[PDB]
Design a protein around this motif. Structure first.
Motif, PDB file in Angstrom:
ATOM      1  N   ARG A  72       0.833  -1.192   0.000  1.00 30.43           N
ATOM      2  CA  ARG A  72       0.000   0.000   0.000  1.00 30.43           C
ATOM      3  C   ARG A  72       0.872   1.248   0.000  1.00 30.43           C
ATOM      4  N   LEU A  74       1.584   4.999   0.937  1.00 31.81           N
ATOM      5  CA  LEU A  74       1.204   5.917   2.003  1.00 31.81           C
ATOM      6  C   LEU A  74       1.494   7.372   1.669  1.00 31.81           C
ATOM      7  N   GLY A  75       2.750   7.701   1.397  1.00 35.69           N
ATOM      8  CA  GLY A  75       3.121   9.084   1.181  1.00 35.69           C
ATOM      9  C   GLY A  75       4.571   9.184   0.777  1.00 35.69           C
ATOM     10  N   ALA A  76       5.141  10.369   0.984  1.00 27.73           N
ATOM     11  CA  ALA A  76       6.503  10.611   0.546  1.00 27.73           C
ATOM     12  C   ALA A  76       7.103  11.799   1.276  1.00 27.73           C
TER      13      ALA A  76
ATOM     14  N   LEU E  54       1.431   8.382   8.666  1.00 22.43           N
ATOM     15  CA  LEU E  54       0.966   8.475   7.286  1.00 22.43           C
ATOM     16  C   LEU E  54      -0.398   7.818   7.118  1.00 22.43           C
ATOM     17  N   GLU E  55      -0.747   6.880   8.002  1.00 28.23           N
ATOM     18  CA  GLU E  55      -2.097   6.326   7.977  1.00 28.23           C
ATOM     19  C   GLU E  55      -3.121   7.332   8.490  1.00 28.23           C
ATOM     20  N   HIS E  56      -2.829   7.987   9.608  1.00 30.61           N
ATOM     21  CA  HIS E  56      -3.745   8.947  10.214  1.00 30.61           C
ATOM     22  C   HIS E  56      -3.717  10.304   9.532  1.00 30.61           C
ATOM     23  N   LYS E  57      -2.902  10.466   8.491  1.00 35.44           N
ATOM     24  CA  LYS E  57      -2.806  11.703   7.716  1.00 35.44           C
ATOM     25  C   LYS E  57      -2.446  12.895   8.600  1.00 35.44           C
ATOM     26  N   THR E  74       4.069  14.104   3.580  1.00 33.64           N
ATOM     27  CA  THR E  74       2.643  14.245   3.343  1.00 33.64           C
ATOM     28  C   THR E  74       2.162  13.120   2.445  1.00 33.64           C
ATOM     29  N   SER E  75       0.864  12.853   2.517  1.00 35.28           N
ATOM     30  CA  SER E  75       0.213  11.837   1.707  1.00 35.28           C
ATOM     31  C   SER E  75      -0.686  12.506   0.678  1.00 35.28           C
ATOM     32  N   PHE E  76      -0.897  11.819  -0.444  1.00 30.91           N
ATOM     33  CA  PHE E  76      -1.670  12.362  -1.551  1.00 30.91           C
ATOM     34  C   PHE E  76      -3.015  11.675  -1.739  1.00 30.91           C
ATOM     35  N   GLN E  77      -3.439  10.868  -0.795  1.00 30.85           N
ATOM     36  CA  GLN E  77      -4.819  10.400  -0.827  1.00 30.85           C
ATOM     37  C   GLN E  77      -5.693  11.348  -0.022  1.00 30.85           C
ATOM     38  N   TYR E  83     -12.293  13.096  -3.928  1.00 28.50           N
ATOM     39  CA  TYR E  83     -11.428  13.987  -4.685  1.00 28.50           C
ATOM     40  C   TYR E  83     -12.141  15.247  -5.147  1.00 28.50           C
ATOM     41  N   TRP E  86     -10.276  18.824  -3.957  1.00 25.40           N
ATOM     42  CA  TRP E  86      -8.977  18.936  -4.609  1.00 25.40           C
ATOM     43  C   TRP E  86      -9.135  19.274  -6.085  1.00 25.40           C
ATOM     44  N   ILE E 213      -5.246  21.093  -0.829  1.00 25.07           N
ATOM     45  CA  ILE E 213      -3.951  20.498  -1.148  1.00 25.07           C
ATOM     46  C   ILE E 213      -2.978  21.667  -1.224  1.00 25.07           C
TER      47      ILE E 213
END
Lengths: 332, 96, 188, 96, 328
Positions: A72, A74-76, E54-57, E74-77, E83, E86, E213
């Motif tokens: 999965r 997650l981010g970067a 990263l799960e909990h944003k 940061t995460s992009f979901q 969406y 955004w 974003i």
């Protein structure tokens, strides 16, 4: 660009010499890449990263893409410039995944490549060729029809017929105890479906992570249905590479690294009868399959290859030309 | 007026008994050792606090785990147990 | 009086009563045995089983059901034979804190709390999501479902008993007369 | 974003031991059987109550003596100890 | 949470975040109350902690001891995979009249704030007359700017003529003539480049919690490692960092005995703060953020302005969003 280094093994250690990036595994230097030829890093799993390395990468604008053990995304760890690529190509994808000439050209090429590769898989046996001449001619006849079908349902029917004609023949290869007849069941009752299921899940997860890292939205697909519970683009592009799992499964069962002892018959909490793979055997199989992923080619590994393919598809969408994206075909 | 709930944890076997015998008058023994009380003027709260202090001096061990958690109107409105039953609720007009 | 006595027992929540929720939990051999005891040995009973244990075809996918379990929705024998053997669930409703009160060819459902219902519903939803994923990914063709037939359209467009999920898809209702929330100055 | 107060008195020590060990992680043990819990989304509250149902089924006692209260931003303000010490105050920015 | 201290090591519980310095636990914050986290210095973060944040944003921003910004995790979901907002933002930000109107508002706010801050030093009024008039002239042209490409040049000239006047207030040991950004090489510039990252982290966490974003900006097209939208909104609020610095230097709280000078990684003259001076400076800055104009802290003003901007973008009206514009 440069090298896009991917770590999907087991617990490497990353260190910096202030002018290079050094990845060691059990104190044996596995990678040593200059910071001017590095473009990104992908970390699939748990990999310790020494703090000077992280600061040196962030100072040089080199994103670090972090992904889970299963795959999965997650981010970067990024900054402005490496993170502009994650959103500067969202609108054009949504435009060009709905225009039917473009999408149907790509969905013709993908199925062409799949049928070609599953012909090549039978070509390499060279020991039961006489029984397979008919099957190979039939698969050629089915492949030649994909060049003309001007709808999605026709493609689905052709690919389904080709897949059935491809799996009808594996009883010649497998030993006596592993002979399977009926199509795949969601709760498995035979070993070979179990092995294929593990392989398909691993390949799907890794393809999904590598597609997301390149800047794509993976629920908007070009050939599959836009839906929840799965990513359309990942299950879309992974079709060309599905033969690796099947070849590896045949290899494992034939060469004796997995026997009848390793499978366990049980009943789940739901009560339905299942047969599953034991924990030691499952770990062994997953490690071997990731090894085959790493042995893809001398120059590129599979993950770098998929990143290059995603960049090609990005350029194809950007310039509107539907044939700049050439698909992997396993040409000899 | 202010609504408080008093929760105390004292180990002296007789001092706990004397606080139990004191606080049952002002409000119901809602839990095993948690009471709910209500006051209209803060001097009445101060009188109760002084009575509590007088009782806990006989412990000779100086226990201080006695807490007065406030309760608002909307706080009471959102409160519940697991079953979903509203709790610490008070009536507006009893038509006995 | 029975309702108030049950309220005194602790059953503070009620549910809308529908026999449909009990179609997925029926164990058929008990039903066939009861009919065989009442009407006697007969060659019809075998036929009855062959009408109740069939398999659904949807888009070249065979949706089966667990052997010796369930009654098919959308059949004429099912509403008649479901409430004929409804009482046999009472023990299985007793352990989970549920009670049924019968009156005028009808009944009503009484329960202490609503947590097992929501856990059963959430388990069913997750199971259906995994089944749809394994439809679209691993190309499965014979799917055996134990529960969740009411959302059988969703696939295409510890164990708790299967009636708990169907109850959990609903939202229940509750059953010195005080008259509102206290004011600034006090109660009158 | 909601603050809660968790309190109980379950009769058997071993049955409520799993209650206590489950509830250590969610909030600090402010007193002998009282917990201060912070939540972000109600689904975490739902799953916590689901597990509490699990252990009370394990106990085979049907204990409804678990009580949740709310703690608002100004309900905290009038909350205190007997010695006047403010309690249940959550920081705005820790400059560690 | 902020970590401006000395060499902390964040680890996880899967439920809590634990901060251990030399195997001494300093904090055990729950993951249900955490909002963001800033790492100024040489702080570590174990990889499973990165998985949990990263799960909990939960955003985390990184910097170095000098104070210059590095990046973010940061995460992009999106929030709930919706969406919608955004896509609305990415459409609206590149529309030319709308973005031009908001960039004109932000530039006019910044120049008005700079003129005002140069206006409350009475004792130097004779020295500061002409400069103020020139800023007025620059403001007199910002309304007449008809293309988004001219705003960058006008704001640059305004900032230059503004920063050239700080040599009159400051002591002789802290004089400077140019804002040196990437390698801060002056005693005074480290203060500004260490306050701007706290301000940026606050506005960025607020914006990302709103639903935005932050990477795409209206007025800041090409940026260097700053998210463009957060570094766009904080333009009006960046005299709270160029007044606190003057107050700290003048009133004797920070003096030249605190700065440490080194050569870093190849050899460059870099001036930084020791750990204790960094903690004092950051704590004072956050305290002054809290004492915003009464009834509202700065967080509760930035969330208001984020909601007003969102309502301006959704209704496609550039007039709903109103820049702060500190009092006449």
């Amino acid at each position: 660009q440069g090298t896009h280094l991917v770590l999907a093994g087991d617990a490497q250690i990353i260190t910096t010499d202030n002018q290079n990036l050094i990845v060691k595994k059990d104190d044996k230097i596995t990678h040593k890449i200059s910071l001017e030829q590095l473009h990104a890093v992908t970390l699939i799993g748990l990999h310790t990263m020494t703090l000077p390395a992280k600061h040196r990468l962030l100072e040089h604008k080199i994103p670090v893409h972090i992904a889970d053990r299963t795959g999965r995304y997650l981010g970067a760890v990024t900054s402005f410039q490496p993170a502009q690529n994650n959103y500067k190509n969202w609108f054009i994808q949504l435009q060009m995944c709905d225009r039917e000439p473009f999408a149907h050209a790509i969905a013709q090429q993908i199925v062409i490549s799949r049928i070609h590769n599953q012909r090549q898989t039978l070509l390499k046996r060279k020991a039961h060729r006489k029984q397979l001449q008919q099957t190979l001619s039939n698969l050629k006849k089915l492949q030649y029809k994909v060049t003309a079908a001007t709808k999605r349902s026709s493609l689905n029917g052709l690919e389904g017929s080709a897949t059935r004609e491809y799996f009808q023949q594996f009883n010649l290869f497998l030993p006596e105890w592993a002979h399977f007849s009926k199509r795949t069941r969601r709760p498995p009752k035979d070993p070979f479906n179990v092995l294929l299921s593990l392989g398909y899940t691993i390949l799907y997860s890794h393809t999904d992570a590598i597609l997301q890292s390149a800047g794509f939205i993976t629920w908007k697909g070009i050939y599959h249905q836009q839906s929840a519970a799965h990513a359309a683009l990942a299950s879309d592009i992974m079709e060309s590479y599905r033969h690796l799992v099947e070849r590896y499964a045949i290899y494992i069962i034939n060469h004796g690294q997995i026997k009848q002892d390793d499978f366990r018959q049980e009943k789940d909490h739901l009560g339905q009868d299942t047969i599953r793979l034991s924990a030691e055997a499952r770990r062994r199989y997953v490690g071997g399959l990731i090894n085959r992923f790493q042995k893809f080619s001398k120059d590129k590994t599979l993950h770098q290859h998929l990143y290059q393919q995603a960049q090609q598809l990005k350029n194809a969408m950007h310039n509107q030309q539907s044939s700049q994206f050439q698909v992997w075909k396993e040409l000899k | 007026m202010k609504h408080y709930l008093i929760c105390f944890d004292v180990q002296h076997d007789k001092t706990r008994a004397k606080l139990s015998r004191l606080l049952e008058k002002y409000g119901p023994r809602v839990q095993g050792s948690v009471f709910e009380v209500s006051f209209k003027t803060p001097d009445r709260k101060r009188q109760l606090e002084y009575k509590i202090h007088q009782i806990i001096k006989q412990s000779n061990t100086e226990e201080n785990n006695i807490r007065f958690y406030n309760l608002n109107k909307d706080t009471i409105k959102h409160s519940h147990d697991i079953n979903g039953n509203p709790i610490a609720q008070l009536p507006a007009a009893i038509v006995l | 009086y029975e309702i108030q006595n049950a309220y005194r027992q602790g059953y503070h929540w009620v549910y809308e009563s529908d026999i449909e929720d009990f179609f997925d939990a029926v164990y058929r051999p008990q039903l066939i045995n009861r009919l065989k005891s009442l009407l006697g040995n007969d060659p019809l009973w075998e036929q009855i089983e062959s009408w109740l244990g069939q398999d659904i075809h949807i888009k070249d996918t065979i949706i089966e059901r667990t052997p010796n379990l369930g009654l098919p929705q959308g059949s004429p024998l099912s509403p008649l034979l479901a409430n004929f053997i409804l009482d046999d669930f009472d023990s299985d409703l007793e352990t989970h804190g549920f009670k049924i009160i019968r009156f005028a060819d009808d009944f009503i459902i009484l329960c202490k709390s609503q947590h097992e219902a929501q856990q059963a519903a959430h388990a069913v939803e997750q199971s259906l999501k995994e089944v749809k994923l394994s439809i679209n990914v691993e190309k499965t063709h014979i799917i055996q479902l134990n529960q969740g037939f009411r959302f059988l359209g969703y696939l295409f467009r510890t164990n708790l008993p299967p009636w708990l999920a169907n109850l959990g898809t609903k939202s229940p209702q509750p059953l010195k007369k005080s008259y509102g929330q206290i004011e600034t100055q006090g109660t009158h």
